[model samples]
Target chain A: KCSLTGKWTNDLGSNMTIGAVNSRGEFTGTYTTKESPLHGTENTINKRTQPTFGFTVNWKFSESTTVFTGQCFIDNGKEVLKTMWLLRSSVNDIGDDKKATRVGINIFTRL
Target chain B: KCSLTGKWTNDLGSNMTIGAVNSRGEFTGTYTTKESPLHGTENTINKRTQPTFGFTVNWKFSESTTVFTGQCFIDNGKEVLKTMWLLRSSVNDIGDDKKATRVGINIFTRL
Candidate 1:
């Protein structure tokens, strides 16, 4: 079985370091999309045969709290996580429907 | 500004009740997807002019922890949260990439 556990770095040079996963498919980690350190949980549903997982980074950073969901797969030879993320931002920075919420995908590789 | 705050119910008969939001654009909530109660945080990045939000429900129920990200819009005068989600399950029960991780969308409205 494969686990989505470990330290991952995205294309943006952002990081998400995870702990060992439990039976409940739950995990804790030190997250960094841009900052000192943010914390959150990673879920794999107590299983690993599947390569999909998720993380919810909490508040602590100035940017905003973020949630990421995606799957890990091997491309060429590297196992990468192709994730979609949603980030909360200041109301004052609100854009239109398409611009307001910071939504994007980040492909991460193990650090 | 339209806040994604308050109690919301989805088409699956699941529930997510949130508390007062903080300046950080973060909020807490009680959840029930298919159980006793699941707790997690809702994120908006401390804004409302934009109508997008996200919630990360923790591990408590037998199902799995989930992350939902979406936009809230008004249809027929009703505010609805159109969200996409990812759920983790048992590795033993793992299916192929398409079936293993539970991925779907739920549109919720204020309750």
Candidate 2:
């Protein structure tokens, strides 16, 4: 019964993501960043019934593919999404090269 | 000259992270969550001088491992790290299984 459908923005105001969660918890979205080398559409599914809602998202960046997986929950009636993501360049299609691959965490809020 | 050595806490107060960045920009840290099934140590590198301080972090969650790659920048003199991450379970270590793999974005602030 949880719905992630809405517009979301990062706290830095650098990126805006438009997303929607279907009845079955299927999620889809498009993310745009300001002057960033990363831009893409993300697809993932979410779990509605859990202590912390868990989900996984795959990003098709302009030149690389990235994946995000994390758990989120509503705190004090506020929805928050916390996730960890890694960018896998097209060259190395396997595990991170542990070199130039990009990785970090993302915590998003509903706009 | 970018040092990530400090105590950081997410806005939700659900997790607290302590990290450090070496002279070579190699970053390492540990994260603890509040009742959430996500806890781990992370390691990555950073770009000292850039429009956006770019960096990557690899997370070692208790039950799984995750990777994060993203760019960050100082805004109004505040340090902000934004990265995307994906959880890679040991079973299908090649690419994300797209089913149980967790994914999300993390925008961290230095405290």
Candidate 3:
């Protein structure tokens, strides 16, 4: 019974705990870059919204257990929203050390 | 079997053709606004690329085919990128007239 969880990183190398996963293999996470270093001529503590979003995955490649298969979606609340990813991994489980291949499909869920 | 395909739109009432789909429900698409109307004082044909990115979806609600379920990810190529949605619909197939409910899980594919 594999599971889903939260993960993220930022420019200033600052990290924060965003959200959590559930038993049914769904995730609800968020990231906020409350404060970060600034650069350029006006270098100061310039902060911007560390954007946050969400996704879901299912480990159901029953044909080949050796391959981890799943789907994911995204939305940033800006101009438009999109979705992609039928991912695969050669590992027994997904970890920071795992490499997954993404099969992307670009579609307009909304106009 | 369901296949993946590309789709897109713009802020203007105009539209264009984007990417193509594959047999595996995988899509590779792009949205280029090349031209758009300005909203602010710069009320002109202030065309921006609009934005173009990609996504993927799955239709597997075996227990309840009454629901059309899927996931999506978006890349606007500007400030930040995001992913969200484990969407469900009460239709047998997704169409121009389908309703969806998205389950959000925010994660950063990049910093």
- Best-matching candidate per TM-score: 1
- Those runs of model 2 whose alpha carbons end farther than 4 Å from true positions after fitting are A16-18, A34-61, A92-100, B1-111
The DockQ of each candidate is: 0.03, 0.03, 0.02
lDDT of 1 by residue, A1-111 (tens): 235778889756777777877766667777775444433444545544555677777757564566778877777677787888776555553232222344556788888
TM-scores vs. true structure, each candidate: 0.43, 0.37, 0.17
**Model 1 misplaced stretches (Cα beyond 4 Å):** A1-111, B34-46, B92-99
Model 3: how far residue A105 lies from native, Å: 29
Better of 1 and 3 by lDDT: 1
In terms of DockQ, the best-performing candidate is 2
What local lDDT score does residue B102 receive in model 2, on the 0 to 100 scale? 49
Predicted complex 3: CAPRI docking category: incorrect
RMSD of 2: 18.6
Model 2's DockQ score: 0.03
Query: For residues B1-91, what per-residue lDDT tens digits would candidate 3 score against the true structure?
Result: 1112223332232232223433332333322334221111111133222222234332232221111122223344422223333434455
lDDT of 2 by residue, A27-51 (tens): 5555655222222222343533422
How high is the lDDT of residue B11 in model 1? Answer: 60
Docking class for candidate 2: incorrect
